[PDB]
Amino acid sequence: GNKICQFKLVLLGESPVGKSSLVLRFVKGQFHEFQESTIGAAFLTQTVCLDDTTVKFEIWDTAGQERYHSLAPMYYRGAQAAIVVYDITNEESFARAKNWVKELQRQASPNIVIALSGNKADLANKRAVDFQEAQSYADDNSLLFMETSAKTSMNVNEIFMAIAKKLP
Ligand SMILES: Nc1nc2c(ncn2[C@@H]2O[C@H](COP(=O)(O)OP(=O)(O)OP(=O)(O)O)[C@@H](O)[C@H]2O)c(=O)[nH]1
Ligand SMILES: [Mg+2]
């Protein structure tokens, strides 16, 4: 196809659930066991082929530490989509993700597409968040849910592509 589309996507979530790792896996096909904490935000881009359209992702990888909370709107304000990430081995991170979803639903663009990533799915032997419970929460709140693993690549390309498919 000869069509070209572009959209802004922001990743939000508690530190250190794997936001930067998810982006690095999608954009560079890499995974680093040792990743420095993000400061403020980092920016990356990736262009993919979706059917007959060349979609360009402008990705804002936010720092998740609490001290950066007041900067979040600078990154989500003009976003067309968001991925709120939690760590499946940490229930508190899942509760934090729900509060990020509430903030987006109240202060981001009314038509933002929101996805929920249950990351570090490769650590299911240490699961703290039930898959079905998270799916139910996502369904009730109109969120695109997938468990992912930046470490193995599980569902990483899939979650980004599913978001792109749901954009106008
Ligand atoms: N096992 C496993 N480790 C992961 C996964 N994703 C990230 N990690 C590890 O988790 C740690 C934190 O990952 P980051 O990507 O820096 O986390 P972050 O959400 O960007 O952290 P902040 O920038 O502080 O908000 C690193 O040691 C990663 O290698 C995953 O899917 N599985
Ligand atoms: Mg980071």
UniProtKB/Swiss-Prot annotation:
| Keywords for this protein | Cell membrane, Cell projection, Cytoplasm, Cytoplasmic vesicle, Endocytosis, Endosome, Glycoprotein, GTP-binding, Hydrolase, Lipoprotein, Membrane, Nucleotide-binding, Phagocytosis, Phosphoprotein, Prenylation, Protein transport, Transport
Result when mutating F43A: Strongly decreases RABEP1 and ZFYVE20 binding affinity
Q: Where does Mg(2+) bind?
A: S20, T38
Query: Where this protein primarily resides, as one coarse class?
Result: membrane
Q: Name one GO molecular function term.
A: GTP binding
Name its cellular compartments.
Cell membrane; Early endosome membrane; Melanosome; Cytoplasmic vesicle
Q: Which cofactor does it need?
A: Mg(2+)
| Switch 2, short sequence motif: residues | 63-79
Indicate which residues are glycosylated according to the record. R106
For the modification Phosphoserine, the affected residues are S70
GO BP annotation list: amyloid-beta clearance by transcytosis; canonical Wnt signaling pathway; early endosome to late endosome transport; endocytosis; intracellular protein transport; modulation by host of viral process; phagocytosis; positive regulation of exocytosis
Any idea of its EC number?
A: 3.6.5.2
Q: Kindly state which reaction or reactions the protein catalyses.
A: GTP + H2O = GDP + phosphate + H(+)
Q: What is the effect of changing K102E?
A: No effect on RABEP1 binding affinity
**Membrane topology type, per the record?**
Lipid-anchor
Q: Where along the sequence does the record place the motif called Switch 1?
A: 30-42
List all disulphide bridges recorded for this chain: none
Tell me the outcome of changing A42E.
Strongly decreases ZFYVE20 binding affinity
What switches its activity on or off, per the activity regulation note? Regulated by guanine nucleotide exchange factors (GEFs) including RINL, which promote the exchange of bound GDP for free GTP. Regulated by GTPase activating proteins (GAPs) which increase the GTP hydrolysis activity. Inhibited by GDP dissociation inhibitors (GDIs).
One Gene Ontology cellular component annotation held by this UniProt entry: early endosome
Give the family this protein belongs to, as stated in its UniProt record: Belongs to the small GTPase superfamily. Rab family.
**Free-text domain note:** Switch 1, switch 2 and the interswitch regions are characteristic of Rab GTPases and mediate the interactions with Rab downstream effectors. The switch regions undergo conformational changes upon nucleotide binding which drive interaction with specific sets of effector proteins, with most effectors only binding to GTP-bound Rab.
Designated name of the protein: Ras-related protein Rab-5A
Natural source organism: Homo sapiens (Human)
What is the name of the gene encoding this protein?
Answer: RAB5A
